[PDB]
Structures are given as structure tokens and as C-alpha cells.
Design a binder for this molecule. Structure first.
Ligand SMILES: O=c1[nH]cnc2c([C@@H]3O[C@H](CO)[C@@H](O)[C@H]3O)n[nH]c12
Ligand SMILES: O=c1[nH]cnc2c([C@@H]3O[C@H](CO)[C@@H](O)[C@H]3O)n[nH]c12
Ligand SMILES: O=c1[nH]cnc2c([C@@H]3O[C@H](CO)[C@@H](O)[C@H]3O)n[nH]c12
Ligand SMILES: O=c1[nH]cnc2c([C@@H]3O[C@H](CO)[C@@H](O)[C@H]3O)n[nH]c12
Ligand SMILES: O=c1[nH]cnc2c([C@@H]3O[C@H](CO)[C@@H](O)[C@H]3O)n[nH]c12
Ligand SMILES: O=c1[nH]cnc2c([C@@H]3O[C@H](CO)[C@@H](O)[C@H]3O)n[nH]c12
Lengths: 226, 226, 226, 226, 226, 226
């Protein structure tokens, strides 16, 4: 690995992955005896214990290209179970800020990264691990957290203009927009890793937030160690 | 409606859809007082009772174009819940003939039918209803049936050659091949229908068959009338 | 073959193919000593004689994927000359219901089936056999039937919405819309089969029918046996 | 028009188009009272009479973009019937040099010119006018000339390397390769022009020529004026 | 070589390429003892002296397919440095007729010629030789000529309609439109040739022309013989 | 802006952009009185003076999606001149480690980000600002630094397998591989920003390094303030 410099045996098999370096640090606090195993290129990685299991929390940055690099190197260091925990913008009216979205699949525009990895333009089913996702539902339900289950659109361009954006994607079965689930799910299927995702609704395109992010992390950590 | 000439209030809200008219007929013998509500163009549709609830069994033929038409017409006729039940070819070594596969997503090559409906070549997530699918898993498990859960490749060409066929699609996270799940799933997300799929393995690319079919149908019907 | 279970030696080299099973049964009365050689999956196939020659009438269902399978298997059973007879929707105002359209080519949206068979997205000329097509023109002329000669658009989505459908395809040299000639013409070119198509206009998007359907059928049988 | 600067009334409705300027000059001697109506950009255009009708012979250069411009402008000058006469490379072993190929359709790789004109990547049937094409067959038959009828591949890159060129295009129903009929057929279908093509086999990729070229030309002129 | 029939040692290493045979001839009067080394298919090529150095002026016709063939054959005949010199249509308001544009890159629609050469649809950078281009800027500046530097769109369809044409390509960083720079630049990068382009503005989409052409040619020739 | 929280009037019009957060900090040391204006999400941004001009050094992370977000927000805060300074892997043998590459254009696979921003799949010329790039050449030459001028390939997948990678891209006119130049150049052309790039060769796919990175930064800063 040339980006994540952690030592082999310093990254757990179970990994909670977030996009924001600051969130990684904030959440490392939920682990027992956390140790910073990497800071190179800004990708903060912490390793500690939880519910009697070793777990790592890693930063993946923004976008398909970035998370692909991070996931590939973590895997080379021993990780094989990944749970994405990030933020998202809801595409439907009935979902409120601070509530969660457990992802069942990801829509995406083809090309680039997908072409290079897949070899052609086939629309390969971009979905998470079935078993793991149900465990997420079970952990969020037990902690009495308000969530919804559905697909999301993994955009590559945050600021690209598209006047019919919300209508187009929501009419396509997607309930929220984010940027790296398609890459995670598809690469995981190709490489044989077990993956899933839960998102915190931070905006609706159709201190209370800190609480929401903290509560969701506990459910995810519970899942990762179940 | 110019293909399925059924009268008003003759098609149930819940529908078990199969590709072979032969199976539609055979399976209708599991209902209470089955009536043939359509035979036009060979698309057999039966409506009767099961566990006290009204339900229908319909023929969709082979291919995306065929099942799209049948689904659109049944929907106009009042249907909104669909569970496809057919046969598939495994793409992995460990699955035996007669066992079952509960579909979690569908891979496909873009163009044609998808382009006309979606209006562009975006890879929209082609997945079943989360809830309904979990119900199928429970039904099949309750009846002690052997099943696997995963994605499948929806092919458009039964006889097209591909020397790398099996390793290609199996390395892409697909455990079996069939021909209409992608159409069913995508159109359902767009139209707002609740769909799922269960397949009977009739061959593995990597009397006893009618019994396997019979047992699985009972589990599916328990789910539609649950 | 796994769909059409007729015994080799039960399928004629000359085949008239129709999408509707009902039409196959009705047109079999035009043959001498008709015999049912297959009913599996609703794909009715009748074989008999017509003016000194053995001829078969087969059902192909709806859509490219369906007719592809049927065509492949009939060929494996000995067929090499196919003339499709079906219904179509006129795209130009001057054509009346009941009249016929003798097809000279097919336009199609690429992808799926064509990609699997051709292996890339090249627009391979989808045309019928030149000779066989002129023989059809002669037969229809001999029976004093009104017809037009032109290209058609082979759609995959009967119900997909397109606010500019008629103008778009008519301005592209097409005079009618159907769903399987492009698959028929292309696969025939690749496999070495001799194929052609005549359609009955059942509606214009821009008793009488029975007789129309019957007269046309006689014209097709003459062509196949001259 | 900015390329062909002939005065309207100097271009016949009936036009025989050839890629080579030299060929245009040589074939003009076949007309009665030939007059040079344009030489701008090397696009030689001659107009005269042939068996009771006014006819023009025009140069179209090499490639789809070139012939597109020339065809558009000749039309703006009054032309509506185009018959291209050129050279071609046979893709099947049985065709000999000097023989002719009467084109029934054109295969092409999509993009560029087709995308700008059609506005998307649909594979619009690229075929000639059915009637005009049969008239050519009749003329060549009347002069006892040896010909074959079939599809051709319209290439854009004469020198691009493809180790499986012959096998690929021949297995796709094409019997020869050229460079501009696809552009000719498609634009004619969209613009409402009546077009056709006959080619002289100058080589097989799988004195005698002069006379071949001359006899064929007489056959084309008869067709254009009958 | 079957298009340009020049003898050995008749084509110079440096070549000024223009699309119009008329200009090739006219421009050859700026050379010392010009000789016509090819007229086949209308592709005029002259070779003579300028500022003591041997150089050639060649006709490439219209369109990517045409210029690709001419460039490949001149290269086989010994040429390896190419400077295209032609006319263009400005896409911005501030550029006046008669002024010049030194090309820094070329935009284009994929497919056709590019697919056959590149073997896939990757957007390969279509740019001129850095060094040669800087030399043109210096030559033109030394001769006090008014020029602009920027990218251009290489169209394949002079007459295709596009109501958003100007704002589309101008908003994409292109300041003018022509038809062969993309082919010239891309093929040069692939074959290892040194190319550049200078265009004379003959119209703006947002006697005195032959003088503008004459002045610019001198600057180009100074560059080729520099 | 929601990622870069700097205040308006806290980001300069001239910006040196690097991918690595650590490099940003390392280089801020070359500025007079540097001030950290942003740390959110790990995107370090410093603002200070150099050669009598205000300049900012900003972190862009890895990949097209990431840099697009950063560039768009910096622009909203007042930046309009960007010079990319990163690392790259050489695709040609003759380029040594620690030497530099001044970029003249970027090759890229289409789709995703480009599709969303461009609206279709046109291969838009992805090039830097002409004037700015020449100034880079002038600054590196004056500091006696060894550099090469050429195009690069902007990959989206660092670890995707491609056995013919070096040959394919180098034969396409690219001398090095990196990941965000295509996005920078194209977005800059669309938005009207002035951009350029210089890369430090850290690997060749065909303390001394610290010195190399430091020396190159001085040349870039000289350019940005010239
Ligand atoms: O519209 C949106 N709203 C809220 N969050 C996001 C996000 C996620 O948050 C990050 C933006 O900083 C991205 O990496 C992405 O995963 N994407 N799109 C949206
Ligand atoms: O490889 C295979 N094996 C077994 N069954 C199928 C099937 C399904 O069976 C039907 C006929 O083969 C199709 O409509 C399809 O859904 N497809 N592909 C395969
Ligand atoms: O618009 C239309 N009008 C009339 N007939 C058809 C048909 C044909 O009839 C069947 C569906 O009604 C298809 O298999 C097709 O061949 N398709 N589209 C049309
Ligand atoms: O392989 C070939 N053999 C013979 N003639 C041609 C031609 C025709 O001749 C010209 C180039 O020699 C083109 O304009 C084209 O129409 N193209 N390709 C071939
Ligand atoms: O819009 C335009 N205006 C002026 N000249 C051209 C040209 C160039 O002039 C030739 C004929 O129009 C072409 O080969 C092309 O290179 N293309 N497009 C335009
Ligand atoms: O093959 C390579 N070698 C050296 N550097 C790079 C880089 C650049 O370095 C970063 C990797 O950390 C990427 O953001 C990219 O711009 N990409 N590809 C290569």
C-alpha cells in the first residue's frame, strides 16, 4: 500500500469507514484504547476494541476514485468487512433531518472507474451484503432509531447542474443522493468483501446532528461486532 | 389492454408470475376455486383462493419485452404486488439442482428496453422490494427448503456465445442466470410496484423437478397471502 | 432444443412464423394434413403440406429474446427459411387498416441481445433476404393485395412513453413499428438463414381483419413454396 | 451551396455520383453534349442528356463527411435521385475482380456524422430505395453483366489495423467493404431522396477494369433514365 | 499507396496540408521551382523550395476519413511533419473575418474513425505538437498578423441541425469549428508525427480573403522551413 | 461552500493546488506570513504572500470528484487561476525520477463526472491555459530544472488491472499517468478559469525527492506571481 502506511496487523478485519477525517477522530472515542495507525495523505485510521472485538475506523475521502484506493489498501492489510457511515441528501419529502437511511443498492452513471474495473459497460448489480444489511436493520431497530430502507444515487459531480435532478432520481427508485456507495458495493462484489452502508440525512433536496451521528455510530459498531 | 383481455375485478392485487403457461396451469391446482380469466396470445392467467386470500397466477413468457407488457397490463387491471417464480442456471459449483435462489438484485447489459424507459443509459439500481424479499426468506426457511441468496444476471440471448461467460458473471457477484429479473425489478421501481423473485435451479453452468417446483410454489403463495 | 420439443424431421425447412399462438392454430387449417409437432411453453408448431411442399407454422411469442430462442431451435431442427407474418402499427397517414407492409429493413436501439450476439455496438445492417423479399412482392401482387414496401422500427418497450414517437421514427425512414424483425434479420444474416417479413396493419398511430389476415397468409405460403 | 458552385438549373434531378474526379471526367463522354457545371474544390460535376433525359455526373470525394456535403448541396440545386457508382473490396472468396455488387444495405460503426444527424445512437436502417434497386438489377441483367446482391460495410478508416477484419464483417452478412454508402442511404432516408449503389470489385481481401467500369456505367445511366 | 502515386524521394519531410486543391495550386506559386508530383483522385501535391529548404504542399480534401488516408500515404512516402492550413467558422463574437486561429486542441464526437484506430471509446487527448505550435505563434507575431489561440470543434456534419450549436461548443472552450483537426492531431500522436494547425476565419457563427490566405501561408512556410 | 469553510476574502485569486494535505503544509513554508484558512474535511488551505502577491495553497484530495468539489468552492470564494502540482508515474523509459512533466493535455475515459457536467459523451478537448503553461516552461527553464512537455492519462482507478496499460497509454501520446488533470482542465474551460499543471515523477511504470518537490514549488510560485 502506498497511501495508508499502517502496518500489517494494525488494521482490523472489521472496518467502519467514513469520508470525513474529523468524523473518524470524533468516533474513535467510542472505542476502547484507540490508537492512531495512519495519518498519511490525511486518511486517518484508528484501531481499538469494542464488544470484545478489534475494530478499525478509517477515512475514505470524497468520491469513487478515493474510496476505491482506500478500500483496496485496507484489504491488502487484512480488512474484509466494511460498513460505510456517512451523510446524504434525501430525495423524498417524507424523510426528516437527522434520521437514517440503510442502503439496499446504488444507481450510478457508467464509465471511468467502473469501465476500468469491469472491462465493459455492463450495468452490474451494485448491492451490499444481504446478511450484513439485515443485521444493520436489527441494530438500529434495537436502539430505537428512525430509519428507512432504499436505494441511493451515487453521484460523481456535486455541483454539476441538472434542473430535473430530484424528480429524475427519485422517480428511479432512489430516496437519497451520496457519492461512494456504488464504488463500495461493486468493488466488494468483485473482490469478495462484505459491505453495507447507513447514512445520516443532513439535507433534504425535496448539536442535534452531533447526537444523531453519535447514536448511529453505536448501532454500526454493534453490527460490526455482532 | 390489448394482450390480457380480463374483465374488471378479475386480476388480484397479488400475483405470482411464471414464464411457462404450462406451469401457470399446473400451479393453479394449488388454489381453491381457480378460474381462467385470460388465454389471449397464450398468456394464461388464473385467479382463485389460497389460505383464504384472493390471488392470481400469470404467464409472462420469455424475455424482457414480453414480461414488461404483461406486467404493465396486469397493473392496469389492478395488480400491484408481483413475485416472479421460474427456473435459472447456477453460475457457481456449490449449488445443486432442485435448490432455490432468492434474488437480491439483477445485472444486465444496457440499451433496448431500458433506454426506451429510462431515457438514457444510466445504470439504475435493479433490486426487489426489501420487505417482500425478507418475507420470502422466512417462508422458505419455515418450510425447511434449501435456498441461497444473491444477485443474478438477466441475459437477453440464451444462445449467444461467450467462452468467458461463467467466470465473467460469477466474478461480478452473480450466482445464477435467467432472463427477466432486471426488467421486473427496474420497471417495478419506476412504476411503484412491490416485486421479488425466487428461482428453481434447473441446471448448473459451473418428476423430481416438478416436486421442487411444487414445494417452492407453496412457500411463495404463503408469502403473497401473508 | 429445450423450448420447442418437436422431433427433428418434424420441422420443415420452410417456416412461417407468427407471434400469436391463436394465429398459428387458425392458419394451420390452410395446410394439408396439419399435425401439431409442439406445444411446449405455448409455442405451437404445426407441420404439413402446401402445393407440393412440406411447410411448418410456428409461434414465436413477443420480443427479440423470445423469437431469438425459437428461431435458433427451429434451425437446430432443420429450418433455414423463415418468413414472419404479424401485425403492425403504421407511422404514416396514408396507409389504411387491413393493408400490408412488406419489410425492407429494421431500425433498432442497440444493446442487450445485439451486444451479446455481435460482441460490440456496431450497427450491422438488419435487412431481409433480397430474393425471398421480391418473391413476396410477386405473390402479393398476384393475389391483387394492396401493400407498401419499407423499413420498420423494432421496439422493445410497447408501453414506454415518448412524446415524439411517430415524428421521430417516421422522419428516420420507417413506415411502421413492430417488435421482432430486427432480431430476425440480424440473426439470420449471422446464421446464414433466409428470412423475410410481411405485416398486417392493425392500427395507425399517425371481419375485415380476419379476411385480411387469411388472404395475406395464403400469399406467404405461395411464396414459401415457389 | 458553398462547395459545388453550379447554378441551379445546371444540376439534373437524376445524378450518378462517383468518388474519383478522374472517373467523372471519363464517364461524361457517355453523355450527349456534356457540359462542366462545377470544378470548385475538385468536385467535378458534368450535366448532359442520355436517352431522352437530362442527367448529371458528380464527384463526391472520399468518406462520409465529404459525400454528405456534396449530396446536401446537389439536392439544394435540384437533385433528388442518386445512384453511387464506385469501387469496392470483396470480403467473400467467390467474387472475382471486374464483377459487380448491387448494394442492399450498409453496416457502419456509429458516432460522429450519424450522431449529429440522428441526435442519438439508434441503429437506423441504412438501406437504398427498394424500387430503384430492382431497376438496377434489371439493367445489369439486360446487359448480361455478372453481379451479386448484398450488404456492405462502410468503413471510415482505410488504414486502421484489425487482425480479424475479413472474418468479422463477412460473418456479419457483408460481402464487401467501401466507405460511403451508409452515409448515402441514411441521409437519403432522412431527406426523402431516392438512392442506390452498384460497385465494381477492384480487389478481393478474402484493360479488363476499364471495360468493366465503362459497361457498368452504361447500366447505371439506363437505370437512371428508365 | 493507391491514392497518392508519387515516386520515391518526391514528397518532402515537411508538408503544408490544405483541403482545397485550388489552394494547393495557388499556394505552390510561393515555392521556387514547384513540380506537380501527384494529381490522382484530385489530391494535388506540389514539391519545391522555400527559403532554401525542400517542402511540399498537399491536398487532403474534406473530412476525417479523407485526411487520414492522405496523411498515412504521405507518411509512407517519407513525410513526418504536418501543418494543416485551412478555413474555419468562429464561435465567438470578438473574432473578425480574415484573422487567424492557432489551434491548441480539438474537441470531437466519438465513434467511427476514432473507434477503428483506438479500438475503444476512450477520449484520447487530441493536441498538436507543443514545440511546432509555439513556433507558429512566433512566426505569425513576427509578421504582425492578427491571431487568437485556442481549441476548435472538429465536426463531421457541415449540414446537421443543432439549435444550440454555438453556445454548446463555445461554452465547452472551443472558439471555432472546422472538420479535420481532431483526426490530424490524434493520428499524429499515435503514428509519431509532428503536427500543428493554423486556420483562416472565413465566417463567424456568433480578393481580401485570398490576401489573408496568402499572408498566413508565408508565416506557415517560414515555420516549416525554420 | 460546504466543504471549504474559509471566509470570502481569505482565498486568493491565484491558487497552487496539491492533492496531499501534508504537502500543502510543507509548502506553506515558502510563503510570507502564512495563515491556515481551512481544515474542514481535511482540505488544508493556506494563504500568504509571495513576490509581492497574495497566493493560496490548497489541498484537493484524490480523484476527479474530489478536486471538482474543491475547485468549485475555491472559485466561489474568489479564485480563478489554478496550478496543479502533484506526483505522477512516467509511462516512458527516458524520463527519470525527480524530474518534472509540464502537462499539455489529458486523456480520459468518458462517463460519470464528465457526463453530468457535459450533458453527453462528447470528447471535449481537455487542455490547460496556453499562456499560463508557457510561463511554467519559462519558470522551470530559468531555474535550470529538467522537464518534459506532453500529455498524460487521468485514471480513475489506481488498482484496476490492465496488463497492457503502459503500452496502450504511451502509444496514445501520453507520457505519464495521474488522476485529476482531465477534471481540472475540462471544468476550467467550462467555468472560464485559467489552469495548468506540473508533475514530479515519483515512479516510472516503463531526501532527493524532497529537494525535487521543493525546487518545483518555487518555479510554480514564481509562475503564479509573474
Ligand atoms: O446532497 C448531499 N447532501 C448531504 N450529503 C451529501 C453527500 C456525501 O457527503 C460528502 C460531501 O462532503 C460526499 O462524500 C457524499 O458521500 N453527497 N451528496 C450529499
Ligand atoms: O441458463 C439457464 N438455465 C435454466 N433456466 C434459464 C432461464 C429462464 O428460463 C426461461 C427459458 O429458458 C427464460 O425465460 C429464463 O427466465 N434463463 N436462462 C436459463
Ligand atoms: O404498435 C403496434 N401496432 C400493432 N401491432 C404491433 C405489434 C406486434 O404485435 C405484438 C404486440 O401486440 C408484438 O409482438 C409486435 O410484433 N408491435 N407493436 C405494434
Ligand atoms: O477495400 C477497398 N477496396 C476497393 N475499393 C475500396 C474503396 C472505395 O474507394 C475509395 C478509396 O480507395 C473510397 O472512397 C471507397 O469508396 N474503399 N475501400 C475499398
Ligand atoms: O463553419 C465553417 N466555416 C468555414 N470553414 C469551415 C470549415 C472547413 O472548410 C472545409 C469546407 O467547408 C472543411 O473541410 C473544414 O475544414 N469547416 N467548417 C467550417
Ligand atoms: O502511477 C502513479 N505514480 C505516481 N503518482 C501517481 C499519481 C497521483 O498521485 C496521487 C496518489 O496518491 C493521485 O491523486 C494521482 O494524482 N497517480 N497515479 C500515479
Amino acid at each position: 500500500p502506498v497511501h495508508i502506511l499502517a502496518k500489517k496487523g494494525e488494521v482490523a478485519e472489521r472496518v467502519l469507514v467514513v469520508g470525513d477525517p474529523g468524523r473518524a477522530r470524533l468516533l474513535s472515542t467510542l472505542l476502547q484504547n484507540p490508537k492512531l495507525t495512519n495519518e498519511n495523505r490525511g486518511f486517518l485510521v484508528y484501531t481499538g476494541k469494542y464488544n470484545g472485538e478489534t475494530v478499525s475506523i478509517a477515512t475514505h475521502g470524497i468520491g469513487g476514485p478515493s474510496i476505491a484506493i482506500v478500500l483496496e489498501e485496507l484489504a491488502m492489510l487484512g480488512a474484509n468487512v466494511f460498513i460505510r457511515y456517512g451523510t446524504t441528501g434525501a430525495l423524498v419529502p417524507y424523510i426528516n433531518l437527522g434520521e437514517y437511511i440503510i442502503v439496499t443498492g446504488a444507481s450510478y452513471n457508467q464509465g471511468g472507474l467502473f469501465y476500468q474495473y469491469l472491462r465493459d459497460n455492463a450495468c452490474v448489480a451494485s448491492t451490499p451484503d444481504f446478511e450484513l444489511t439485515n443485521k444493520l436493520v436489527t441494530s438500529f431497530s434495537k436502539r430505537n432509531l428512525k430509519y428507512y430502507v432504499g436505494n441511493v444515487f451515487s453521484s460523481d459531480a456535486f455541483y454539476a447542474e441538472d434542473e430535473e435532478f430530484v424528480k429524475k432520481w427519485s422517480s428511479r427508485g432512489n430516496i437519497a443522493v451520496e457519492m461512494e456507495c456504488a464504488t463500495l458495493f461493486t468493488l466488494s462484489k468483485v473482490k469478495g468483501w462484505k459491505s453495507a452502508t447507513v447514512l445520516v440525512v443532513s439535507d433534504n433536496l425535496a448539536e442535534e446532528l452531533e447526537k444523531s451521528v453519535m447514536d448511529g455510530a453505536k448501532a454500526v459498531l454493534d453490527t460490526l461486532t455482532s
